[PDB]
Amino acid sequence: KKISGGSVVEMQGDEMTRIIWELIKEKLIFPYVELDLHSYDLGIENRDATNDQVTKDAAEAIKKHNVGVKCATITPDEKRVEEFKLKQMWKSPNGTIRNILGGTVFREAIICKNIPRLVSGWVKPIIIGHHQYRATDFVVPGPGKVEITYTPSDGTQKVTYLVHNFEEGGGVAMGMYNQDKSIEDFAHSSFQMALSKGWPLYLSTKNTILKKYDGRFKDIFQEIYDKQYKSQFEAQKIWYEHRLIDDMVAQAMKSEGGFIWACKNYDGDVQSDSVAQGYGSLGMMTSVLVCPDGKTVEAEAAHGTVTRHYRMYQKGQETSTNPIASIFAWTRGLAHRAKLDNNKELAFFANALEEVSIETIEAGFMTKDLAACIKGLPNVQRSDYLNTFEFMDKLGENLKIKLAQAKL
Amino acid sequence: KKISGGSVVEMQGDEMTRIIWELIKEKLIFPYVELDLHSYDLGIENRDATNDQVTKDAAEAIKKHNVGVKCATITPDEKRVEEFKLKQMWKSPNGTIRNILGGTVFREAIICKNIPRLVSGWVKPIIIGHHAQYRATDFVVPGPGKVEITYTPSDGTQKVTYLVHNFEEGGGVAMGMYNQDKSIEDFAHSSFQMALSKGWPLYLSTKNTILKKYDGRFKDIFQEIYDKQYKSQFEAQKIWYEHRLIDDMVAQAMKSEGGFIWACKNSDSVAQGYGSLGMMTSVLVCPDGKTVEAEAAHGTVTRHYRMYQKGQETSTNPIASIFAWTRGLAHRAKLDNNKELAFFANALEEVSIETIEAGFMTKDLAACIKGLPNVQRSDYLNTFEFMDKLGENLKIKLAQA
Ligand SMILES: NC(=O)C1=CN([C@@H]2O[C@H](COP(=O)(O)OP(=O)(O)OC[C@H]3O[C@@H](n4cnc5c(N)ncnc54)[C@H](OP(=O)(O)O)[C@@H]3O)[C@@H](O)[C@H]2O)C=CC1
Ligand SMILES: NC(=O)C1=CN([C@@H]2O[C@H](COP(=O)(O)OP(=O)(O)OC[C@H]3O[C@@H](n4cnc5c(N)ncnc54)[C@H](OP(=O)(O)O)[C@@H]3O)[C@@H](O)[C@H]2O)C=CC1
Numbered sequence A: 001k002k003i004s005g006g007s008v009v010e011m012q013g014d015e016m017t018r019i020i021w022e023l024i025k026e027k028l029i030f031p032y033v034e035l036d037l038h039s040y041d042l043g044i045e046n047r048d049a050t051n052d053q054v055t056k057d058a059a060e061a062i063k064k065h066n067v068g069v070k071c072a073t074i075t076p077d078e079k080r081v082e083e084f085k086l087k088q089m090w091k092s093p094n095g096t097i098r099n100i101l102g103g104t105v106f107r108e109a110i111i112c113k114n115i116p117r118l119v120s121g122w123v124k125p126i127i128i129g130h131h132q133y134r135a136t137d138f139v140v141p142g143p144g145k146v147e148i149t150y151t152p153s154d155g156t157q158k159v160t161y162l163v164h165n166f167e168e169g170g171g172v173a174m175g176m177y178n179q180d181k182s183i184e185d186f187a188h189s190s191f192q193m194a195l196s197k198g199w200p201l202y203l204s205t206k207n208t209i210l211k212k213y214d215g216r217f218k219d220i221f222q223e224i225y226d227k228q229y230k231s232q233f234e235a236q237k238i239w240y241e242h243r244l245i246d247d248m249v250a251q252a253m254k255s256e257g258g259f260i261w262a263c264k265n266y267d268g269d270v271q272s273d274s275v276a277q278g279y280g281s282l283g284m285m286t287s288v289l290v291c292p293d294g295k296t297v298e299a300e301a302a303h304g305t306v307t308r309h310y311r312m313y314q315k316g317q318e319t320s321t322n323p324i325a326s327i328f329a330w331t332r333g334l335a336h337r338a339k340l341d342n343n344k345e346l347a348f349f350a351n352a353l354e355e356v357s358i359e360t361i362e363a364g365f366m367t368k369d370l371a372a373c374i375k376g377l378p379n380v381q382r383s384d385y386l387n388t389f390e391f392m393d394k395l396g397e398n399l400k401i402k403l404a405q406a407k408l
Numbered sequence B: 001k002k003i004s005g006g007s008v009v010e011m012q013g014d015e016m017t018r019i020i021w022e023l024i025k026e027k028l029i030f031p032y033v034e035l036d037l038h039s040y041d042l043g044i045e046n047r048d049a050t051n052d053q054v055t056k057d058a059a060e061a062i063k064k065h066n067v068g069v070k071c072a073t074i075t076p077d078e079k080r081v082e083e084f085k086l087k088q089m090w091k092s093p094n095g096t097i098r099n100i101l102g103g104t105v106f107r108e109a110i111i112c113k114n115i116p117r118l119v120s121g122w123v124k125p126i127i128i129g130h131h132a133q134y135r136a137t138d139f140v141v142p143g144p145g146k147v148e149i150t151y152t153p154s155d156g157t158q159k160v161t162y163l164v165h166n167f168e169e170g171g172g173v174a175m176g177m178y179n180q181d182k183s184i185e186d187f188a189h190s191s192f193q194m195a196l197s198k199g200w201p202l203y204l205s206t207k208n209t210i211l212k213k214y215d216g217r218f219k220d221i222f223q224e225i226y227d228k229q230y231k232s233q234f235e236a237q238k239i240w241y242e243h244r245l246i247d248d249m250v251a252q253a254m255k256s257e258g259g260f261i262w263a264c265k266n267s268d269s270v271a272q273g274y275g276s277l278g279m280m281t282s283v284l285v286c287p288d289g290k291t292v293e294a295e296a297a298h299g300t301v302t303r304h305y306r307m308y309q310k311g312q313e314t315s316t317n318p319i320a321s322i323f324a325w326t327r328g329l330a331h332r333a334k335l336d337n338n339k340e341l342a343f344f345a346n347a348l349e350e351v352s353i354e355t356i357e358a359g360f361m362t363k364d365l366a367a368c369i370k371g372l373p374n375v376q377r378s379d380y381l382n383t384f385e386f387m388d389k390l391g392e393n394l395k396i397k398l399a400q401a
């Protein structure tokens, strides 16, 4: 009866998202899909006990099965250690996975006709790809010479570059780098994303300023395009072009959306996440780690565990947490699984669940944050929204009807 | 009798803005104000004829007289070298001026109650200043090996060597960048001076959680300069200074109503995408608190100038160019304690906002309310009709006194 799903590496998480995650599987995934699930408990109470081995095991499993779906997890800080009696302030589970699997992170917001966009003209989502987190910075305490050097590993002559001669007083200095392989893995991930979506791709740099550094990004993309993708792109009526960041900002805002934007100097936490957080649309933002093979993906919600809401849930208070970015972690993983397995039944299910989600909201049934995008952050009434469990139920009902009406 | 405006440095420019700049002086400035006008022609052909000496002299004149008002200018590229048969690709005049004067550029959008904002909650303008990557040393790493950054103090008692990266698999790129304390101090002074001038609070944003040393130094110097030199001046005006992590600042700004100064350590391209470039001012604030260079945030508007050249009707927004004059004249009035000039510069800003708020505007403003496809010929005024309208309204405002 159920749809064959195939091999999927699941990762359980923490707090409010963990609550939502189970509701998704129980009400939206499992009644219709039978999966070869390879579940890992990346909850903090199990990550500490297993000495963050569950995190390492989860990562190797995604490499093996090619499809990973991750719940949001608590990234440990000093204050969290007192709450769980933590044996160590462990690494970020996402940092660990990214270091193991590699690849480019692509962000995408979920668009609904009745939910205003920051730029009203955006009817189709904009997808942003990006690799200062690698920088080595320090204080210069007084006069002296700061130099940056390259020492070949083969014993040949080191090359010296003067950064600055501080004649009077001190200041600050830093060194940054990028590996050709990382730039190549980013070009491949971006060209494959544009083909898998049927949208054009743009790369933005400041190669007029950082002529060598950014010039290398522009040349690598172009080299990979012309030799491995130009024909495949031209046979989909789409394209690839390099843009200076200034022209790209303006172009993006005058656009209708529906393009891929490979952004070199990009701070996703700020330019996407913080803007989304301030706009009140974090619950509608998705993230997908796309490895250079074109086979390995790890899909997740761009947001965190939603701690504030989880506390109200513990304190017996009613919550209205948006589950869409969480559902879309599942739908994006299942869509990629279907692509690999040539599974038309699974490809349809992933498509139908995304549509039910968009359609329910468009029909007037939504969580508090979505109601706030319409009415204004402080202007929501209880009658404007459905709570966490109420919304999941409405999605469930609409998913049933939609799947029954599709046979014909 | 006309107002005695005093010493003002003016820089004439290029293409569409040159046409607007001359209309502003003839129609809005010269009928009410007399100036001891130090006028420099930064038109591309004059910069070429003088080997860019006019640009350096204009900057020297701003330093001497403290007030500069600048028209947009062509920055030569390959296509411009050919178009004007230039002796060489002359450097940006703005770069030359900024290099000679020093200081921080603050951008500010002009708000009208009938004109939609990107974030509707912003009912008051946000003033943004960036620290100004351009003094970096970047290179290509040909293959495996170590990239290290070293500091050697002048005495020679020490040497610290930091690993940037040990390239183990192939090549890539690397770069080194720096900031002198003086440059950070100057940025703090301009920022505190801007906040004191507007009577608005100031926020410094950095990524000090990641660049703990590099950005922590910006955080430390701003706090130290504030505590010793500005804290009492801020308390007297009931304003405040605070540091913010960039992530929190962006979220906070999105939820804000505006009316603050934002010193950014990491707008006009956002204004261009939005279709509001003609409503954005730009002001270079020197750390001395005496020298100011005011201009529109936009360029010469070449696309519109080609239309004007071909007889075709143009609807170029002149407000940002007007606000370059009002801002410079208001600073001149403050340095000289000239109530009449202060009154004039403020009234010209009010007239501008009132005219737009009464439904008399340019195509870009009409497109902001309605959207460019739905814009009908009658929804907007052309450059010249709009300038005449502002002129009529200015005469009335000034007559009612
Ligand atoms: N990939 C991952 O695993 C990530 C994990 N985290 C972790 O999550 C924890 C909490 O982080 P925090 O800074 O609060 O970031 P969150 O994204 O969890 O929450 C930030 C705020 O944005 C709003 N928001 C986010 N998602 C939703 C949603 N689905 N529905 C409704 N509103 C939403 C809420 O606003 P309001 O409070 O106004 O309701 C929320 O408190 C930390 O322990 C952190 O380590 C953080 C980022 C990523
Ligand atoms: N400070 C300075 O002196 C600056 C000079 N420049 C110079 O200006 C020239 C033109 O550059 P360009 O890239 O076109 O940048 P511009 O800012 O001159 O124009 C870009 C576009 O923005 C819109 N726009 C800008 N100003 C106005 C206005 N006042 N009213 C209505 N719309 C406006 C128009 O859009 P639309 O086409 O959709 O109508 C315009 O074509 C170049 O030679 C460049 O070097 C550039 C920036 C600053």
Ligand SMILES: Cc1cc(-c2cnc([C@H](C)Nc3nccc(N4C(=O)OC[C@@H]4C(C)C)n3)nc2)ccc1F
Residues within 6 Å of the ligand: A107, A108, A109, A111, A116, A117, A118, A119, A122, A124, A125, A126, A127, A128, A249, A250, A252, A253, A257, A271, A272, A273, A275, A276, A279, A281, B273
């Ligand atoms: C101009 C410009 C844009 C962006 C940018 C950032 N993040 C996205 C996300 C991944 N996708 C998307 N797609 C459609 C709508 C939409 N959003 C929306 O309406 O409000 C909320 C959210 C975003 C503004 C966060 N977000 N797109 C573009 C980045 C730099 C820039 F300079």
Ligand SMILES: Cc1cc(-c2cnc([C@H](C)Nc3nccc(N4C(=O)OC[C@@H]4C(C)C)n3)nc2)ccc1F
Residues within 6 Å of the ligand: A275, B107, B108, B109, B116, B117, B118, B119, B122, B124, B125, B126, B127, B128, B249, B250, B251, B253, B254, B258, B267, B270, B271, B274, B276
């Ligand atoms: C956090 C954040 C901030 C900013 C931003 C950019 N530029 C400014 C300028 C200097 N001032 C100002 N002030 C009030 C309104 C306002 N504008 C407005 O509403 O539409 C037109 C114009 C600008 C968006 C061009 N512009 N302010 C804020 C942008 C995105 C963000 F995500």
